[PDB]
Design an enzyme around this catalytic site. Sequence first.
Site, PDB file in Angstrom:
ATOM      1  N   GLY A   1      -2.788   3.059  11.625  1.00 43.15           N
ATOM      2  CA  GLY A   1      -2.147   3.971  12.553  1.00 43.15           C
ATOM      3  C   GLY A   1      -2.381   3.607  14.005  1.00 43.15           C
TER       4      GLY A   1
ATOM      5  CB  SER B   1      -1.537  -1.358   9.913  1.00 40.94           C
ATOM      6  OG  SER B   1      -0.848  -1.645  11.113  1.00 40.94           O
TER       7      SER B   1
ATOM      8  CD  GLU C   1       3.887  -7.125   8.007  1.00 41.06           C
ATOM      9  OE1 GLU C   1       3.864  -6.126   8.756  1.00 41.06           O
ATOM     10  OE2 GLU C   1       3.242  -7.183   6.941  1.00 41.06           O
TER      11      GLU C   1
ATOM     12  CG  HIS D   1       3.634  -2.727   9.455  1.00 39.07           C
ATOM     13  ND1 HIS D   1       2.657  -3.688   9.311  1.00 39.07           N
ATOM     14  CD2 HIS D   1       3.026  -1.654  10.014  1.00 39.07           C
ATOM     15  CE1 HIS D   1       1.506  -3.212   9.749  1.00 39.07           C
ATOM     16  NE2 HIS D   1       1.703  -1.980  10.181  1.00 39.07           N
TER      17      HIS D   1
END
EC number: 3.1.1.8
Length: 516
Positions: A113, A195, A315, A428
Amino acid sequence: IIVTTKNGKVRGMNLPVLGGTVTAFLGIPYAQPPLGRLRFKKPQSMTKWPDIWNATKYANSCYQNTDQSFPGFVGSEMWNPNTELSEDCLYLNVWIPAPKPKNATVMIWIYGGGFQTGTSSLHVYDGKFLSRVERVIVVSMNYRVGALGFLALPGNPEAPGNMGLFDQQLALQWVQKNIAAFGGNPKSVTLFGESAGAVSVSLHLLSPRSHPLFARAILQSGSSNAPWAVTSLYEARNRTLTLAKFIGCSRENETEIIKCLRNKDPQEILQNEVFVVVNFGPTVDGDFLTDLPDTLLQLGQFKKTQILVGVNKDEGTAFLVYGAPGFSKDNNSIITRKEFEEGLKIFFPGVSEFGKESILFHYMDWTDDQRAENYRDALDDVVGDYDIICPALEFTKKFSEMGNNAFFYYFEHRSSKLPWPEWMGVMHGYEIEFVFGLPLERRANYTKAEEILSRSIMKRWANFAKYGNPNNNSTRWPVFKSNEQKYLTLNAESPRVYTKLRAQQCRFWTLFFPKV
Ligand SMILES: *[C@@H]1O[C@H](CO[C@@H]2O[C@@H](C)[C@@H](O)[C@@H](O)[C@@H]2O)[C@@H](O[C@@H]2O[C@H](CO)[C@@H](O[C@@H]3O[C@H](CO)[C@@H](O)[C@H](O[C@H]4O[C@H](CO)[C@@H](O)[C@H](O)[C@@H]4O)[C@@H]3O)[C@H](O)[C@H]2NC(C)=O)[C@H](O)[C@H]1NC(C)=O
Ligand SMILES: *[C@@H]1O[C@H](CO)[C@@H](O)[C@H](O)[C@H]1NC(C)=O
Ligand SMILES: *[C@@H]1O[C@H](CO)[C@@H](O)[C@H](O)[C@H]1NC(C)=O
Ligand SMILES: *[C@@H]1O[C@H](CO)[C@@H](O)[C@H](O)[C@H]1NC(C)=O
């Protein structure tokens, strides 16, 4: 269903999962609430309770700005928090298979995030299916994000930096001291995340005090050597002072700039956070991280163990729809060359005009792709290669040069339930639902092939956690070595083995682009 920890007793609940049962403990505290004088500070060990902690419900999510770029759109709001926001958010969840195992491998999930948003209570992070199918124990924790988790003053214990990463470290410490009571092997712990969570996992690999807290690591679409991952300590002193000017806490005495910030409201901090420029992420604080990750990798200063790394085919597309001219989720986003060059200015702020001409040449003018989608697809490849794919490949190559087994995947399947449009492809973040086994619920209306693909991915993930190798008559996933550089594609039809992913592009970003 009561388990005794070292701080008290906790109650669980039994969940019907795929014709069976999974025991879940949702909301176990692992640190004192960072309220009052503990705001911006490193987490303190949790206090004891004589009663029974109920732990039957997802705990609070840490304060964070929500994504409101696409109102009502599920594709964006599925990542927004789904519990009450409060600073009292340092809790973790545990999923134990049924019947209770005795020495089960533990997989600890770290959500992403951008280090500004995220929570462990999201539906796509539900560990009950993974615990059911692969008989592993799944842990996940909430850690502080934004300024409340990464406000940095150099060497100042009131706000030292990397507080959110220390939240994760203390949650790993809880697993070493308590997972045996739940049926988990504290010496068989694997960290996995996506991520910013994959950046987090790869920073624990570069933090010596985290090495004895886990055995193996899995990096999904992220690595701490990415251009956006870590700031320098002076870069983090700036922004911290900039926020103080915006919020009205500017002092010439530094240690009392934090006393002014501790008496502001959490929503007040969140509204001035965004005006500073990853505005508050990991920094080289000298404590959790002693040097830039690229330096630590070159010096071999990291935990020597096996890693499983991978990326998705498209991505960059999610990045472009949030701040690039011409891109939209409501049309095919056919962009012009002028919009392409303006996209480069956004994702390459400091580079020269010749540097942008180098990118345009190597991605456009070097070939004969005269399709109407040329500039659009190429800008997805520019951002995807520069920010995710090539850093992840360099991280894996460094672990391989030192002699650690590594496994690399290339996710190519687009969910039949993907709410974003088709031009964004394999985005992603949208392999996570296959890793956690959401297509296994036939009521979720995934295709039958997607259930098969999900069981395959969960098996490979759990095999790597248990035995250090994801692999039988299925297609063998070879070891990634520095010479051949083999990787495996993940798709619903037939996984294939290839070599040197995006090799020509990564050679441009690592060998030629730094020289312009
Ligand atoms: C895909 O969609 C994007 C996003 O646009 C938004 O969604 C679309 C589905 C549609 O509803 C759009 O109206 C909506 O904004 C498109 O990119 C946008 O393109 C528009 C024009 O179509 C741009 O807005 C214009 O920008 C100028 C500033 O540089 C300015 O000249 C314009 O204002 C003038 O003209 C309008 C009439 O259109 C008039 O009302 C004004 O008073 C004034 O004279 C106008 O604001 C957006 O900036 C673009 N957005 C981005 C992010 O760049 C894209 O073109 C579309 N692609 C395809 C292939 O259809
Ligand atoms: C904890 O759960 C038990 C069992 O369902 C319930 O009886 C009890 O009321 C709960 N505790 C609180 C404080 O609500
Ligand atoms: C679990 O396995 C470890 C080695 O992986 C061993 O040292 C330990 O004794 C085992 N514990 C139990 C409870 O079986
Ligand atoms: C942060 O850095 C910028 C760029 O050098 C500078 O102009 C600004 O004053 C700094 N902010 C501070 C010191 O609060």
